[PDB]
Each structure stands twice: as C-alpha cells, then as structure tokens.
Amino acid sequence: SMEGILDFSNDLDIALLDQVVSTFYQGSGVQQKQAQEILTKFQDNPDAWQKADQILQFSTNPQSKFIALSILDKLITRKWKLLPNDHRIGIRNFVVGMIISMCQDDEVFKTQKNLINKSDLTLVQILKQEWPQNWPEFIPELIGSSSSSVNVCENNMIVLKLLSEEVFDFSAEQMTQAKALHLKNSMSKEFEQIFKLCFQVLEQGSSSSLIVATLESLLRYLHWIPYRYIYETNILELLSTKFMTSPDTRAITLKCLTEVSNLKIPQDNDLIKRQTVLFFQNTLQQIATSVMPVTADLKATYANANGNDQSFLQDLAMFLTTYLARNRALLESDESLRELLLNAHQYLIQLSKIEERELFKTTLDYWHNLVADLFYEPLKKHIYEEICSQLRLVIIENMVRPEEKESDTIQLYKSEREVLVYLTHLNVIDTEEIMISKLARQIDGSEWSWHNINTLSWAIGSISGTMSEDTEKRFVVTVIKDLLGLCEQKRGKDNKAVVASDIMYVVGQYPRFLKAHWNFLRTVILKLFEFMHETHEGVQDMACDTFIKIVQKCKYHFVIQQPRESEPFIQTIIRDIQKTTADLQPQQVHTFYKACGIIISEERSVAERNRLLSDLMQLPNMAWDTIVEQSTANPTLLLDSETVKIIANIIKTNVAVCTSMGADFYPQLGHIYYNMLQLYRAVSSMISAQVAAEGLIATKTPKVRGLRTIKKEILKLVETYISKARNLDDVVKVLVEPLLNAVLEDYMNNVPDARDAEVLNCMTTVVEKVGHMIPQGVILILQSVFECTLDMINKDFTEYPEHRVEFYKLLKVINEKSFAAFLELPPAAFKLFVDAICWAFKHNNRDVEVNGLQIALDLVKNIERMGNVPFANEFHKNYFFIFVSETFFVLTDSDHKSGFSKQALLLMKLISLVYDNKISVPLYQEAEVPQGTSNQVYLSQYLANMLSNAFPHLTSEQIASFLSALTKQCKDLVVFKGTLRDFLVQIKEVGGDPTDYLFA
Amino acid sequence: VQFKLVLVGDGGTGKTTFVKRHLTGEFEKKYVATLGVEVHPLVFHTNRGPIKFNVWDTAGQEKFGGLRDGYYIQAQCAIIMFDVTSRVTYKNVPNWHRDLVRVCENIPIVLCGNKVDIKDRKVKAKSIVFHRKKNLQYYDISAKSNYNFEKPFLWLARKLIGDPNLEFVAMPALAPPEVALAAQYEHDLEVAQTTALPDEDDDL
Amino acid sequence: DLRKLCERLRGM
Amino acid sequence: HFEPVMEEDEEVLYKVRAKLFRFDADAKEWKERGTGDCKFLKNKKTNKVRILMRRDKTLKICANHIIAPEYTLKPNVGSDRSWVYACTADIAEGEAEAFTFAIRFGSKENADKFKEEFEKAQEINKK
Ligand SMILES: Nc1nc2c(ncn2[C@@H]2O[C@H](COP(=O)(O)OP(=O)(O)NP(=O)(O)O)[C@@H](O)[C@H]2O)c(=O)[nH]1
Ligand SMILES: [Cl-]
Ligand SMILES: [Mg+2]
C-alpha cells in the first residue's frame, strides 16, 4: 500500500509520503526496508522534481522536505539548463522564499536546522548555475537583508560559507576549469562588501549563534582571501582576544588563527611581523588566563574527556605546531619574546604527554621540525635546552615497539627514533643520564614492569650510532650489566624471559660494538644458541631473529679467522648445526641456514666458499639423496604426508640459503637440479592422479596441498636463483630447457583448478633475466600458458585471482623483452592478445589494470618502432580504433578512476600518432571517405561520431570543441588531462559550455 | 539506549564486510554492492550496560547511492571508511566528510583505513592526516584479520555514553539445555564434511 | 678484553 | 580512629585457541562464527561439561552447548586440524538452535588433543 506515492497519474498524497518517510526513518525491519526501496524509486523518478513545490509547502515532515530538496538538487546540478526558463525562475523563487519564511519563524529557525542547511545548500547549487551573470544583485541584497533580522543574517553566513566551499574548496573535481575560475573571480570581485558585513557582525554583534556562524564562514574565507583583509583590519585582535575568552567561539576562532598562521605573507615587512607576533601573544595569554595555565596536567584533562576538552586540546596542538613551524624565528631573537616562545613550547610538552596516538604523532612531527633545525642552525639550540631535556623523557617513556604485524606502530617508532637521535646529538650527556637513571628505577622496582623495561630498551637501542665509540662502549657495558643484574634479580618465568629478550635486542642494535669486541660477540652468539633449546614460548623465535640480525651486520667477523681462534667461526657454527637446531621449528631452521648463507657469501675465495656451502647443506643433501632413492623406488612414498613434509622442508632450506647467496648458490643448485625437476614431474603425476580419482575436491585435501607445496617451493627456488644469477650462459644452456620441459606441458594439460600460478611467476623471472637470449623458449611459454590461462580469467573479474595477476605480469615482460614472440603468433592468437589487454583495462583490480595500460602503451611503442612495414600498417588498421575507444570507455565510465593518469597517457600517445603522421596508411576504408582524406580528419570524424552516440545529450558543438582542444594538446599531458577532466564534468550534466575547452 | 550510526565511504572499501563481521562473526569474500542502505542492529555489552548501534550501512557506489545524504539525518555517530590499498578512496574521504557533517554538524566520527592485512599498502601511514583538523578518531583496521576491528565501536561508545573508562565485558553465559531426524542430519553432515573449510593456510 | 661481561652473560 | 575514604560456578577442564565455523547448508558454504578461546566448563553443581567459546575483544559468545554424549567428531575433507559435528542445541545467539559446526585449531596436535578431551568430557556427561 505504501507503493501508492509511485503513481504520478494521480495527485500525490502528502500524508502517504509522510508515512513512508516515517516508516523508513523511525521504523524497523521489513517495514523500514520496504519504505527505503519505495522512497528510492520515488526520488529517482525523473518527474519527481515537479512534485517538490507541493511537498515543501504542504508537508509537515522535515525529512520529507529534505528528500524533496535532494530531488531538486539532482535536477539543478544535472538538468538545470534543459528546463524552460519559466521553471528556472520558479524554482529559484520558491527556494528563496522557503528560506526567508523559515528564518522569520523563530520556532522553525531554532528547530529545523537540518532542513534550513539543506535549503541553503540547494540555493548554492542555483547560484553555481545562475550567479552572477543572471543574478548580479544577489550579494548586495544579501547584505541588505542581513540587517533586517538576526536569524536571516546568521543564515546568510551559512549561505556564504557553503558558497565559498563549493567555489574554492570543492570545485576542482566538480566543475570545469573555466566555470571554477569564473565563480572564483565573481566571489573575489564582491568580497570587499562580504568582509565589511562579516567584520561588523564580529565587532558589534552579541548573538552567540550569529557570531559562531560568521566565524565559521571566515574560516572558509581564509583559504583564499588576500592577506590585506586580515593584517589591515584589526580582525586579528578580535580573534586572538575577544573570541578566545568565550568557549562558544573559542574552537572556531582557534581554527581561524591556525589558518591565519598559513596566510601568504611577505617575509620582509616589519609591521606584519609584529602583527604576527601579537596575535600569538594574545592567544597564549587568553589560554593561560581563561582555560588552563602552562603547568596544567593536559594528560589528565584529556583522559577525563569533559565537554569539548579533547577537541580543544587537539586544536591547540594544531595551532601551536602550525604557527611555530612557520614563525618561531620571530620569537627567538627579541629577549622580551623569550617567555612567550618557551611557554608555547611548554604547552606542547604537556600536550605530548597525552595518551592519544594520533595527537602524539601531530606533536611528534613538530618536534622533528624543531630538533632538526637546532641540529643545523647556528646559535639556536641553547634557547631550547630545557624544552629538549623534557622531550627526551617524553619520547623515551612513550617509545613504541620497533619491528625488532603493525605498520602504524613501525612508522611511529622510526619517527620517534629520528627525533631521539637528533636530541642525542644535541646533548649526549643529558640523554645518557636520563637513560641510566630510568634503568636504576627498573632495578629498584619503583618503575619495574614488562612494558616499562621494554620501552626503555627500545629507546636505548634506537640511539645506536650517535654516541662516540668510547662512550658507546662504556654506555653499552653499563646497560648490559644493569640488564644482567636485573635478570638475576627476577625469580619468575616470563619475568626472566622479558629481560633476556631486551638484552638481546639492545646488543643486536649495537653492531659497531660487537665488531670491535670479538670475545663478546662470540659469547652473544653462543648464548643465542643456548636459547634455541629453550621451550618457553617466544624465546626460540627471539634467538633466531637476533642471530640473523647480528649476522647481516657483522658477517665479516664470522668468515675470517679471528686471533685466538683456530678456524673461522662459521666452521664452528656449521659443525654443531644439527645440535644447535635440534629443538627448532622448520621456519626457524631455515632462518638459521639463511643466516649461515649470509656469512658464507662473504668468503670471496671460490673454493672455500663452495666447501662451506656443501658443508652447510650436508644434512639436507643427505636427507635429499635418501629420499630421491627411496621415493623413486616406491612412488607411493609421496602419499606419506611425513615424507612430503620432509621434502618440502629440504627445498625450503635450499630456498633460504639461495636467498642469502644468490649467484653463489649455483653449485648447490647443480647438486639437486636434475633430480629436483624429476621430483617435480612425479609429484605432478600424483596430483593429477589424485584429482582424477577423487575430483576437484582433491585439491583441498592436505595430501594434495602438501604435494603442490613441493612444486611451489621448487618453482620459488628456481625463481630465486635465476633472478640473482650473474652467469646467464649457464642459466640459458643448463637450467632453462630442463625447466621448461618440466613445467610448461604439465601446466597446459592440467585442469584449471590444478594449475599453479607460481608457474607464471617463475616464467616471468625467466623472461626478465634471459628472455632476450631464448626467443624459441619465449614462444614455447606463450604457446603453453597464453590461451589456456586467458580462458580461466575472461569470464569474470573474480575467479583465479593469482593467475590473473601473474598472467599480465608475464605478458608485460614478454612484450618488453621478446616482442618478436607476439609477431610469431597466428593472427587469431594476436587478436586474443589485444582482447586480453583491453580485458585488463576493465579490471578495477589495480594489480591488473595498471599492467593492462602499460602493455597497451608498450605495444604501441613496439609497433611504432617497426616503422612503415606491413605488420604495423595492419596493426593500426585492425586495432588503432579499438584501443582509442576502449581507452575512452574506461576514461568516462566512472568505475576506473584510479587509472585516469595512465589512460590519459595512452590516449595522448594514440592521438599523437595521427597528428604526427606516424601511421603510414589510411585508417579508413577506400570506400567510406574520399580518396586522400588525412587520417587526422578521419580521426576527428570517427571520434565525433563515437562520442555523439555514446553521450547523446552533448551538443555537436561540445564534442567538436572538446576534440579540437584534445588534439591540439596531445603534446602536453597536464593540459591534456585537464581537458579530459573538463569533459568528465560536462558529460554529467546538460548544456555544458563548449568554450570551456578553450581554457588553456 | 540506542544510537544511529551511519557508515560511509567509497564502494569496495569494506563497509558491509566490516559490519557483517560484527553481526555474525563471518568474513564475506565476495563483493556484493550495497543498494542504498542496509540497517542492522548491533549490540555491545559494556561495564555501563548494553549499548545498541543502529548501523546504517550505506552504498559507496554512486549508481547505487539511493537517498545519499538523506541517510545521514539524525545520525548520532559515524564511521568514514577507505581502503589503504586504493589511493582514490582516501582522496574521496574529504568528500564523504563534507556531505556528512553538513547534515550531522556535531557528532563523534571515526575514520577507518581498512584492509591493512594486504602487504602492498598504498596509502602510507604518514599520508593519513585528514582527521587531525577535523577532530576524527583514526584507526588502521582489517575486517579480514580483525585488526583493531572493535576500536571504532569502543571509541564511539565512550563518546556517546560520556564515559572514558567504558569497557566491553563478557556477556553472561547461561547454562545450555540438554538434547526421528537421524537420517536428516547425517545428510547435512555428509555435505558439511565434504565441503572444504576456507583459508586452510591461515594461522587459525 | 671484557672478561667480566662475557662471564656475566654466559651465566644468564 | 580515622574513617577511610556467568561461569563462576564452573571449572575449566580444557582451554585451546580455535576458530569456529557454521555450515550454511543453503549456500553450501562454511561461515566463520568466531575466533577465541574454546573452553570445556564443568558445572560444580551438576558435573555437566559444556563448550563455551567467546570472540576476542568483543568477548561475545559464539558457542554454548553441552558436549552431548551422542555427538561424533568427524574429519573435514580439507583439513588435518579440524573437526566437524552436528549440534542440536546451541544458545550463543538467544533461542536454542541446531547447527553443523566445524572447529579448527593451530595444529593437528591441538586438534587431536581437543578430540581426546572432547571424548573424556562426553563420558563425564554420560555418568
Ligand atoms: N583483504 C581484505 N579484504 C576485505 C577487507 N574488508 C573487505 N574486504 C573485501 O572487499 C570487498 C568489498 O567488500 P564490501 O563490504 O562489499 O565493501 P562495501 O564498502 O560495502 N561496498 P559498497 O559501498 O558498494 O556496498 C569484498 O570482497 C571484501 O571481502 C579486508 O579487511 N581485507
Ligand atoms: Cl600516545
Ligand atoms: Mg556495502
């Protein structure tokens, strides 16, 4: 029954509308959901605007009048210029009158603020269409009507606020360059009279709601108005004194003063400098006397969260950091301004103690600005020594966990480290003293806690590389000592664990110290090995992460024979590796082997490096040899989940070591390569035999997933070596051909759900590194993966997401390195190739879309380089206009905004081909256009017709003007893009001005 | 004790997935665009009593926008959502905020950057600053990994109730009851056994 | 040489 | 003298981290119901053992039912660390209700121990 409002042949029952509306907003469940769908169908009726005048005069529901104005908004912004001029004036008149009538009724004005705001916004939409050209008296009449009534005056401030927003803050996306400039110039021309009204209301007015609205409009004005209106009118005194005392006006006033702290200012006028000093002085005085003194506990205040305290302290932080980043130099020389400078910074110190991550980052960004300036600028740091001393404590005490899952925490640690490093350079002694002192209160239990000892250890670790080696030495020793005694002092389990982790973290951050103290370094490592047998949760993971961390930094000291030692320490690690790693999980074993690989790669003697390599790999190589014997014997073993897991861990170990050693890993790869690819084939047969015997569900089972893990790790190992290989002759002549024989046919002839996308990734690396040397191999790759993978991904944008991504990375690199492989494609296959590229255009998926556009661009450049030959001439004849129109489609369809820049580049390249006469043959049929017509004339003609049918609501003049500008600007990307953006605005409405495309 | 919450942001940012996670605990992998709005009651149990959010999960796609800002009328709080893997969705946050506070002038608002579980993050933490001058709370969240997934509602509950120490508490757990259709459940069970569980590589 | 520290470290 | 200024009746037999699924038979789809600590709780006044599971952070109940002796844990085709079983009365979301549950754990080891303890608890409820 609620569906009756959807019948326009009858008069609209306003009472029925109000029931649908009430059911939607105040109702629930099915009733609400039904009214929602009805109201949506109502609002979207293209005649619904005609019934807006009824609703606005005769409804009693504010939500109904709001929805009526939404309907009007759609009409005004999209179809305004289609109306007969009678309806435009009529709509304008009964919007103006509805606002005046609401402002005159004090009760409605007070209680229907939502509906008045919506009406003002609607009025603003009309102004964007009609003002000033068809409404030159709007601003003069607004200024006159303001004095007749406080309610109307207050509402006119709302109207001006929204107008300034629509013209200056939100126009870049919503209107053409020409229309935006027109409205900006129009507001700028009449602002003298706007400012006069605003200044009088502020100087004289006493209505709080009127003052607040006027200041809220001023905030918008400060985004664009010239500086003279601010520095030559005494308004700074009003803002920084009168309006900071009242809490009603204090929030907006502070936001205004923050913006003022960014006005365009000449840096040489002495008075402007004094005015800038003065409004800061006034503002800080009002805060100290009306809000809270410099000594106030802002952390406690913020935690209590009374009234608007939190927003005020946020706004204060923004004001102080903004002003001081630009202007603190004005306060640093005059001795009478020193108290102001330091009180402002003392407020910031107190604000920096608040528990609020995002506010802390705001203050921390300022501190970085400051301490970096004190580090470089002569004679400045002594001014801030007491500020900086307090900041050392704030940062040390709020240090967050370093990476050593949470990237916001990781970014915050790095920012904290940066400021604390500066602070340490500024006073190394104060920093050491604070840190030693904090540590004493860990030992004496007054500040002991898991968090507090972690925080301090992170701080201590963060300043590595700032002190002198001798002070570092004395410093580091003292810390470790104090940390060791702190560990003994604890009798607990987790207690003893925490202090141990922190100890190993600190030492891991001071490689310079470890490098110069071998005896200590050795003892550190051996204690890590001890910890690799500790079953307590998290210790083993800690030991391994520290081990490789130290190794990356100190590897050279493991590869040389150290005095007092009979062998390089890497040999000692390798000898006992089985014992050392006996209690570790597989992931942690591979990290250990990887760490050993880093060391071994430092040995530059080839024969010693290879010996170390084969020693390191002795255990996995023996397990490997055993399995290749007892698994080739009875292939049934590979169904034993335990053997499958063992196999995967052997290969994972080779991956880990190959990751560290890269080119140097080749000897170990050669030991397993041929049998590894045979294992790849055997595992492949089992997966296939399992899918045949159980169905596609087999691919979800642990057995088959374990078998595919083997295949994936084999591919990853090959990928890892080839991407780092330095001897490419061996890659091409030893590795590639066995590899392709092993993986390509197996991929082609498996059912879709059994194909590994890692095959494509592996082939991408092969083509990347040696693609230029294996043209026949690249052709074979395409033959084996191109069509069968395309058929997997060309039915929707969702299935087989990994194949989708890797597929277009493979085509991208083939198109880069071995374009000849696409020349060899049969015409039907090269056509699938074009289809595949355009298919990529239409993905919202950024990983696919970006490569699709790059392949298109690279393909055009590949074709262009061929010159005037039959393949290029056929390409342009067959596909030039497909690429033009497909690019235009994603540019204009509103679902591919993220690719705008590369779409524009592609479109500019295509148009420039024609207007540089780089296409040698006619793009048209011998029939459809007179003999001798230039491709330029035919392109302009094809596109005009294309756009006329795709966007039929555009005038022939709009299209013709747009294309003229576009073709003129095909050598100027940024202007080209502006013209495309202008087009995107115009296609959203009726009656766009074709002269807009002359903006540039 | 119920509060209207409007959820806004570009299409595909994860608004509906985020709410569903809170409603049923599930993670929906498919993208079924919201049409207009979907209203879902959401109750949290706190040390100050239960609090009810009437969540208006709105459509981010323009062609499915429905009543658009009409959905914001009488909202008492809001979440603005973007996707840390899609720069354009952060670029559009000021547009959603503009349309939102024109209707809801003084409400607590949380800004959420979703999908932090994805390795290749595009909106870096250091670029996210829009909330500062606008007094929005910001959280990195992931509806997939549940990272910070409760923070937006906990912060809003504290603002709406006016208690900075409000906490979520364990809802009481009543004693469950004790226990023709044997051939019926053995069918549904055989189907369930043979439908693989999703995300078998997850830690849990 | 830091004999003292290495010994304190070994005994953790 | 200066004046100055509901599982409490239950015992925890077993606790393990787990993720719980519910089978949407109409969609032929497993749907996540909650991740958190799974507890076997023995009421001290009846000796009846129930499963009680809560979601991390929100602490909302995602499983609450007796470990009925008639229940049977079965493997899932895609996992060596999960169990499937039918449940005829679960009160996590209000009115009693029947579900086909799957519960997955961090390891096959934790999965087998769960079945160990699950069977132990079934005969507690039996006797
Ligand atoms: N990796 C990852 N994916 C997510 C996350 N949150 C949502 N998604 C996915 O993003 C896609 C879209 O989710 P959806 O909730 O429909 O977004 P929406 O904002 O409601 N879209 P609309 O506004 O059109 O209704 C889904 O495929 C979903 O699985 C997340 O946190 N991480
Ligand atoms: Cl903080
Ligand atoms: Mg949605």
Author numbering:
A (entry chain C): 0 to 376, 414 to 440, 457 to 1052
B (entry chain A): 9 to 187, 192 to 216
C (entry chain D): 457 to 468
D (entry chain B): 64 to 68, 79 to 200
Published text:
The chromosome region maintenance 1 protein (CRM1) or Exportin-1 (XPO1) binds 8–15 residues-long nuclear export signals (NESs) in hundreds of different protein cargoes. NES sequences are very diverse but each usually has 4–5 hydrophobic residues (often Leu/Val/Ile/Phe/Met; labeled Ф0–5) that bind hydrophobic pockets (labeled P0–P4) in a hydrophobic groove formed by HEAT repeats 11 and 12 of CRM1 (9–16). Here, eight new structures of CRM1 bound to diverse NESs show several different and unexpected NES backbone conformations that share only a common one-turn helix element. All NESs also participate in hydrogen bonding with Lys568 of HsCRM1, and mutagenic/structural analysis identifies Lys568 as a selectivity filter that blocks binding of non-NES peptides.
We study three NESs that uniquely match the all-helical class 3 pattern (Ф1XXФ2XXXФ3XXФ4). CDC7NES is far from the protein C-terminus but structures of longer peptides suggest that CDC7NESexits the groove after Met468 or Φ3. The mDia2NES and CDC7NESsequence patterns should thus be Φ0XXΦ1XXXΦ2XXΦ3. The Φ4 anchor position is clearly not used in mDia2NES and CDC7NES even though Φ4 is key for activities of several other NESs. The number of Φ anchor residues necessary for CRM1 binding can vary between 3–5.
